Amino acid sequence: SFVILFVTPLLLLPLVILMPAKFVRCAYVIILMAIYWCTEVIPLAVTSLMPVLLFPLFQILDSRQVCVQYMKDTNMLFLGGLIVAVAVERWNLHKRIALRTLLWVGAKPARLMLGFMGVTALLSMWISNTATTAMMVPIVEAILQQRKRLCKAMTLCICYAASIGGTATLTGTGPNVVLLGQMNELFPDSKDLVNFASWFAFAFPNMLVMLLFAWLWLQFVYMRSKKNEKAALKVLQEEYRKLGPLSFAEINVLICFFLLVILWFSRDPETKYVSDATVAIFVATLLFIVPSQKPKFYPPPLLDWKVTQEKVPWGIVLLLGGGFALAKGSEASGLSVWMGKQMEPLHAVPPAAITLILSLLVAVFTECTSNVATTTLFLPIFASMSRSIGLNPLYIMLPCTLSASFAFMLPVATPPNAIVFTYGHLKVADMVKTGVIMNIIGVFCVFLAVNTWGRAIFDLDHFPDWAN
Amino acid sequence: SFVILFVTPLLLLPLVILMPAKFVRCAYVIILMAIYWCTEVIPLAVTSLMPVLLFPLFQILDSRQVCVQYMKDTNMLFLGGLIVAVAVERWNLHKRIALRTLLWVGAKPARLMLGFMGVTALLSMWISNTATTAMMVPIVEAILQQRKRLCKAMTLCICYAASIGGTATLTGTGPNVVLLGQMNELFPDSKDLVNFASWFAFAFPNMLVMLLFAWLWLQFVYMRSKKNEKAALKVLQEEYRKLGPLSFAEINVLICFFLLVILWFSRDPETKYVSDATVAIFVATLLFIVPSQKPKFYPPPLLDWKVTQEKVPWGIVLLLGGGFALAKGSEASGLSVWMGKQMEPLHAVPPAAITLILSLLVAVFTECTSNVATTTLFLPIFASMSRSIGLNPLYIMLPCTLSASFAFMLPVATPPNAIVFTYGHLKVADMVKTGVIMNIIGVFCVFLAVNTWGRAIFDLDHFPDWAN
Ligand SMILES: *[C@@H]1O[C@H](CO)[C@@H](O)[C@H](O)[C@H]1NC(C)=O
Ligand SMILES: *[C@@H]1O[C@H](CO)[C@@H](O)[C@H](O)[C@H]1NC(C)=O
Ligand code: NA
Ligand code: NA
């Protein structure tokens, strides 16, 4: 069974060691790492460390040129975002925001589902999508204890909303960070063309329209009620009180978060040095000295180190670094130029079809693998193709990144779906039926976004000189 | 009180922003980070992230040139060592080795203390010194429940032995890794002159002699017994049984550890690419597929990801990276050349005095700060001095690294001393009296090592061209 998945490649190492052309060796590396990505027999971060273990033997890079690539500005940006998210989770803040929103919108099962989806998307924009599901699903259970075709709807709404809302912030989730990293590496002359501001402008409207379509679809398939308008409130309120009053530390973390947002947007409404990573580190550092209590001599802070050592996806960081290393090795060996020399005859094809086909393919493929793995595997190929056919790479690379998060079925695809299914009445057939359509929805919305307004944001109708 | 420690430096930022010479700005950065190092009001890894937050504003480096420096071959070497250590701790192996050794040596309070110190040093060579103390101190308590001048001796023996034994492996603890990193950065033409093999050869004899002197001293100050020969055995044996038999997974992790050691030594008893980091990653990766049980289809491994996400000092990794970034900024701005131009007139001095004085100073100073912080602050200065006075840098840099771990008092200096003091009868006066002398012992032993055999290992009698 699962033994061949790590012993069979040993057959090829003595065959590929000689192979008097390095792009073959890099290709074998990438294929092996993909096979391990899709199969979690071995973890992900572990496989992200293969490049240092393989590029040397294949005489591609040293252990220095490759290991230097495992931490760059993107990774520390993501790390700062994660730390801020940890501060938010530490104090039951996201629960307070959630309950306030739910009580404002009202308990009307239609508007109820709308509020759940909207707040889940807004929280997922910064707050580690799985965490939001963990926070919210107990609320749904508490509601429902007070139709087997209804529980499925809201339970799926949480996960779909989270996976969608994560695509509205450049931290958000892995794939967007991967896009930023590959843009920096493959296209360094594109110094700062895809930043937090521009990408947010591109993505947030797309997120909103996808969320609208999703709410409509899930209100169709499952729901084509005075107590549940009332006895749901008596649960929301009693859960609200348990948080207690406004909890002074919550205020300070909110202020720090607002400052982060303002600094990210403001710089980009000269010999620049001050990339967004500096801002993230600014606020993350600041989150260790602030008191969390009234000084009336600051014994108490609001964030210690032990929790953030416990609660941070470092494996994700190493995963990104593996992507960086793969891109560097491909650029060095000679594989990228080779692919760009094999994808020449696509010059006759309409690019819109290319974009749509590849986005659909990625949305399908991410439903078995992880999102970030899918992205970091696919993006360099599309980049080389775009360079070859006189096309702007972003045209292809943005929709792929937005699509890699479209894991709307297969609970193994993304943890949130697993968490939702763990509570029972969400038979996988329901998930597949409701997920394929939403994959299509997301693809169409993304294509609309790229061909409508992304043009002017990124100047996609012309062939930039930063893709020679 | 502790408020000025992070608000007073704000006075100087608008004063130092202009400062038409960049070495002043880098110096202010280093001073501030030192002040935060010595004062744990803010954690350590957080302060290690200041360089990305400061070098840009001071127009020294971008956010890319500096953030690229936070992960290099040294850090991943240390990470692999940490992961292997985690595998060891996972299965109660180090306890099994310990009990076997203790039962072999015997329960004779003299030889008992000797066995405790020796095994603690041997385990600390790879196994995260604090962990060994946590493992062993309960054993001492169990023994002693079955002289208030005796408990102090063994209780201090654990911590001293751990802090000494950590200086015998290039993973070991932070300072040695810092030395390797600074050698790579400041002196890159010294490609691989300080590796695991050479440094181990230099250090292990020094560790042995220091441990001998320490055992002698602690047998002097406190201890200038049939039951404790007997009723200690009835505790060791009954603790041994609780581990059960040899626990098949233990065997596999031992085999992996042996393979790691053999690969580290063997390569160094051509266009090299295969540095020790590759080996560490090799074995660390291997530690995720091995079964830990009889396959009789490998449901069970021996190391999952969640534990190593929980139990790994990542803050240490970021700390090292901060050291790397500081060194890069100093080399870029113009500060290193400036220091080398101010330390010219030391050409008239005997280098032996320089080495001894600086080693003593570092051994004193590390008893309030952390070891790794002390090292990464001090080493570039000594390097610049050595370049200036026609001297081999290693002469000065090795003893400083070995000395930074000589935290033989001030429980705040190093966690092991804190753990020992947490159990009571180790009044701080005793610790100081017994610790200053051992600082002197360590300094003398290190000086003997450098001036005796380190010469031939590193060719310290000549001025290498890799220090121009
Ligand atoms: C960059 O552009 C120039 C066109 O003048 C081209 O000759 C050169 O090969 C290109 N280099 C890369 C790395 O794309
Ligand atoms: C390296 O050595 C040469 C001596 O030929 C010296 O001129 C040059 O300045 C040195 N460069 C550095 C960076 O030490
Ligand atoms: Na997925
Ligand atoms: Na210390």
Side-chain angles (χ1 to χ4, degrees):
Chain A
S1 57
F2 316 101
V3 182
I4 59 171
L5 305 170
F6 36 65
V7 185
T8 310
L10 281 164
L11 170 53
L12 298 94
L13 266 63
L15 178 74
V16 71
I17 50 174
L18 185 77
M19 265 292 151
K22 300 124 84 74
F23 50 84
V24 190
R25 305 169 207 168
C26 197
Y28 181 83
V29 174
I30 294 167
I31 293 157
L32 181 61
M33 293 168 62
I35 296 160
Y36 285 125
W37 282 141
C38 182
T39 57
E40 293 181 13
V41 288
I42 187 176
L44 287 81
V46 176
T47 61
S48 174
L49 295 155
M50 287 192 175
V52 52
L53 191 69
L54 299 174
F55 279 103
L57 285 81
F58 301 151
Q59 303 287 316
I60 299 161
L61 305 187
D62 322 22
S63 179
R64 293 150 78 268
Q65 298 168 326
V66 65
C67 181
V68 80
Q69 306 290 0
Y70 271 69
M71 184 72 75
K72 301 204 276 196
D73 52 67
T74 77
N75 300 37
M76 285 208 321
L77 192 86
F78 187 59
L79 179 137
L82 286 167
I83 290 158
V84 173
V86 172
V88 171
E89 296 169 25
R90 256 264 272 172
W91 315 88
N92 54 342
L93 182 140
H94 51 50
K95 195 190 290 290
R96 201 181 282 282
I97 284 166
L99 287 217
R100 182 65 231 165
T101 47
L102 301 200
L103 282 148
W104 169 51
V105 300
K108 310 190 121 188
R111 245 197 259 187
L112 199 149
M113 185 194 302
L114 174 49
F116 277 61
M117 294 246 284
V119 74
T120 323
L122 266 289
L123 271 43
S124 70
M125 271 153 69
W126 345 82
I127 309 298
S128 72
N129 304 350
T130 178
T132 73
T133 66
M135 173 263 291
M136 211 168 287
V137 175
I139 319 190
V140 174
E141 274 206 314
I143 292 279
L144 296 170
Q145 266 87 283
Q146 269 290 1
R147 299 248 168 164
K148 57 181 67 43
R149 194 164 78 270
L150 184 63
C151 325
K152 296 172 182 185
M154 284 173 288
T155 47
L156 264 174
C157 272
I158 314 316
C159 56
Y160 291 144
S163 52
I164 291 157
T167 74
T169 66
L170 185 53
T171 66
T173 163
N176 308 308
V177 188
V178 183
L179 160 59
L180 174 51
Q182 270 64 331
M183 182 53 49
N184 296 8
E185 287 182 315
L186 292 112
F187 307 112
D189 299 9
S190 155
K191 311 196 218 301
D192 37 61
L193 197 72
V194 39
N195 47 40
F196 201 97
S198 44
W199 187 93
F200 181 95
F202 178 81
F204 198 73
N206 174 84
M207 200 281 284
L208 287 169
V209 309
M210 288 155 51
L211 196 66
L212 257 290
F213 278 45
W215 172 65
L216 266 70
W217 182 242
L218 277 75
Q219 206 66 27
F220 182 82
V221 310
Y222 294 119
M223 312 302 293
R224 291 161 260 279
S225 167
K226 328 308 177 196
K227 308 322 212 317
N228 289 74
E229 171 140 8
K230 187 196 64 31
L233 303 168
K234 160 149 38 265
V235 165
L236 290 161
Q237 297 169 344
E238 294 289 354
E239 178 55 28
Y240 195 36
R241 299 192 309 93
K242 307 229 174 298
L243 297 101
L246 183 52
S247 185
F248 176 86
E250 296 191 23
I251 301 162
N252 286 280
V253 53
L254 269 160
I255 294 161
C256 300
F257 170 67
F258 292 154
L259 181 126
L260 179 62
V261 171
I262 296 155
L263 287 159
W264 273 337
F265 294 171
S266 63
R267 193 187 74 267
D268 292 324
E270 171 49 34
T271 330
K272 271 278 170 171
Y273 291 133
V274 202
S275 167
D276 305 323
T278 60
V279 183
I281 297 305
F282 200 151
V283 66
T285 290
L286 235 156
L287 280 168
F288 284 101
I289 80 194
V290 179
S292 106
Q293 278 282 15
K294 296 213 180 297
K296 305 191 65 52
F297 207 137
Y298 308 147
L302 83 185
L303 197 62
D304 75 80
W305 172 255
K306 94 190 284 290
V307 302
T308 188
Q309 186 157 301
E310 289 174 7
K311 311 178 75 133
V312 166
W314 321 88
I316 307 305
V317 183
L318 296 127
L319 220 169
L320 315 202
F324 281 88
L326 289 177
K328 178 56 179 302
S330 56
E331 204 282 341
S333 52
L335 175 133
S336 296
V337 61
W338 179 76
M339 289 197 291
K341 182 56 168 63
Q342 290 299 315
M343 282 104 98
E344 215 190 16
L346 281 20
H347 76 315
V349 161
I354 302 303
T355 303
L356 179 53
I357 296 284
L358 300 168
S359 45
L360 181 54
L361 175 154
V362 175
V364 173
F365 183 51
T366 189
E367 300 230 74
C368 63
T369 80
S370 172
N371 289 337
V372 63
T374 304
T375 304
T376 183
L377 289 170
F378 269 103
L379 296 187
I381 318 186
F382 305 158
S384 192
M385 169 152 47
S386 187
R387 292 175 43 87
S388 179
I389 67 185
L391 184 65
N392 186 290
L394 287 152
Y395 205 142
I396 325 182
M397 299 165 71
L398 304 165
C400 168
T401 53
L402 289 171
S403 304
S405 76
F406 298 169
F408 299 154
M409 45 168 158
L410 270 285
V412 308
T414 322
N417 289 281
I419 307 185
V420 179
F421 185 81
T422 49
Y423 290 76
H425 45 21
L426 197 81
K427 314 310 180 190
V428 179
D430 303 332
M431 173 166 299
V432 171
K433 301 152 180 287
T434 60
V436 62
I437 291 286
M438 293 240 295
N439 283 50
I440 297 155
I441 283 168
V443 172
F444 164 60
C445 296
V446 170
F447 179 49
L448 176 63
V450 175
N451 275 54
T452 39
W453 63 77
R455 276 190 164 81
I457 283 169
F458 298 125
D459 196 72
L460 305 181
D461 302 57
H462 295 87
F463 185 39
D465 293 321
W466 50 264
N468 312 28
Chain B
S1 57
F2 316 102
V3 182
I4 59 171
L5 305 170
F6 36 65
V7 185
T8 310
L10 281 164
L11 170 53
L12 298 94
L13 266 63
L15 178 74
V16 71
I17 50 174
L18 185 77
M19 265 292 151
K22 300 124 84 74
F23 50 84
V24 190
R25 304 169 207 168
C26 197
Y28 181 84
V29 174
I30 294 167
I31 293 157
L32 181 61
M33 293 168 62
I35 296 160
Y36 286 125
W37 282 141
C38 182
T39 57
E40 293 181 13
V41 288
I42 187 176
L44 287 81
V46 176
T47 61
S48 174
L49 295 155
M50 287 192 175
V52 52
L53 191 69
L54 299 174
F55 279 103
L57 285 81
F58 301 151
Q59 303 287 316
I60 299 161
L61 305 187
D62 322 22
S63 179
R64 293 150 78 268
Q65 298 168 326
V66 65
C67 181
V68 80
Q69 306 290 0
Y70 271 69
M71 184 72 75
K72 301 204 276 196
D73 52 67
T74 77
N75 300 37
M76 285 208 321
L77 192 86
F78 187 59
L79 179 136
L82 286 167
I83 290 158
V84 173
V86 172
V88 171
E89 296 169 25
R90 256 264 272 172
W91 315 88
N92 54 342
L93 182 140
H94 51 50
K95 195 190 290 290
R96 201 181 282 282
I97 284 166
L99 287 217
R100 182 65 231 165
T101 47
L102 301 200
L103 282 148
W104 169 51
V105 300
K108 310 190 121 188
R111 245 197 259 187
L112 200 149
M113 185 194 302
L114 174 49
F116 277 61
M117 294 246 284
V119 74
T120 323
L122 266 289
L123 271 43
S124 70
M125 271 153 69
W126 345 82
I127 308 298
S128 72
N129 304 350
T130 178
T132 73
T133 66
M135 173 263 291
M136 211 168 287
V137 175
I139 319 190
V140 174
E141 274 206 314
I143 292 279
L144 296 170
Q145 266 87 283
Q146 269 290 1
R147 299 248 168 164
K148 57 181 67 43
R149 194 164 77 270
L150 184 63
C151 325
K152 296 172 182 185
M154 284 173 288
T155 47
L156 264 175
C157 272
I158 314 316
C159 56
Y160 291 144
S163 52
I164 291 157
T167 74
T169 66
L170 185 53
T171 65
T173 163
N176 308 308
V177 188
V178 183
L179 160 59
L180 174 51
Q182 270 64 331
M183 182 53 49
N184 296 8
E185 287 182 315
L186 292 112
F187 307 112
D189 299 9
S190 155
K191 311 196 218 301
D192 37 61
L193 197 72
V194 39
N195 47 39
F196 201 97
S198 44
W199 187 93
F200 181 95
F202 178 81
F204 198 73
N206 174 84
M207 200 281 284
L208 287 169
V209 309
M210 288 155 51
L211 196 66
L212 257 290
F213 278 45
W215 172 65
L216 266 70
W217 182 242
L218 277 75
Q219 206 66 27
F220 182 82
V221 310
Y222 294 119
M223 312 302 293
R224 291 161 260 279
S225 167
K226 328 308 177 196
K227 308 322 211 317
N228 289 74
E229 171 140 8
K230 187 195 64 31
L233 303 168
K234 160 149 38 265
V235 165
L236 290 161
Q237 297 169 344
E238 294 289 354
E239 178 55 28
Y240 195 36
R241 300 192 309 93
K242 308 229 174 298
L243 297 101
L246 183 52
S247 185
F248 176 86
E250 296 190 23
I251 301 162
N252 286 280
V253 53
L254 268 160
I255 294 161
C256 300
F257 170 67
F258 292 154
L259 181 126
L260 179 62
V261 171
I262 296 155
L263 286 159
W264 273 337
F265 294 171
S266 63
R267 193 187 74 267
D268 292 324
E270 171 49 34
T271 330
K272 271 278 170 171
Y273 291 133
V274 202
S275 167
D276 305 323
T278 60
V279 183
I281 297 305
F282 200 151
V283 66
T285 290
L286 235 156
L287 279 168
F288 284 101
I289 80 195
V290 179
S292 106
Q293 278 282 15
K294 296 213 180 297
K296 305 191 65 52
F297 207 137
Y298 308 147
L302 83 185
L303 197 62
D304 75 80
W305 172 255
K306 94 190 284 290
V307 302
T308 188
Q309 186 157 301
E310 289 174 7
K311 311 178 75 133
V312 166
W314 321 88
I316 307 305
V317 183
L318 296 127
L319 220 169
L320 315 202
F324 281 88
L326 289 177
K328 178 56 179 302
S330 56
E331 204 283 341
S333 52
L335 175 133
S336 296
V337 61
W338 179 76
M339 289 197 291
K341 182 56 168 63
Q342 290 299 315
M343 282 104 98
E344 215 190 16
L346 281 20
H347 76 315
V349 161
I354 302 303
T355 303
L356 179 53
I357 296 285
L358 300 168
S359 45
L360 181 54
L361 175 154
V362 175
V364 173
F365 183 51
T366 189
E367 300 230 74
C368 63
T369 80
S370 172
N371 289 337
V372 63
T374 304
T375 304
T376 183
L377 289 170
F378 269 103
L379 296 187
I381 318 186
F382 305 158
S384 192
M385 169 152 47
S386 187
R387 292 175 43 87
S388 179
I389 67 185
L391 184 65
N392 186 290
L394 287 152
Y395 205 142
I396 325 182
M397 299 165 71
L398 304 165
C400 168
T401 53
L402 289 171
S403 304
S405 76
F406 298 169
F408 299 154
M409 45 168 158
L410 270 285
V412 308
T414 323
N417 289 281
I419 307 185
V420 179
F421 185 81
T422 49
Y423 290 76
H425 45 21
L426 197 81
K427 314 310 180 190
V428 179
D430 303 332
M431 173 166 299
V432 171
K433 301 152 180 287
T434 60
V436 62
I437 291 286
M438 293 240 295
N439 283 50
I440 297 155
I441 283 168
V443 172
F444 164 60
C445 296
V446 170
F447 179 49
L448 176 63
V450 175
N451 275 54
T452 39
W453 63 77
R455 276 190 164 81
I457 283 169
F458 298 125
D459 196 72
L460 305 181
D461 302 57
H462 295 87
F463 184 39
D465 293 321
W466 50 264
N468 312 28

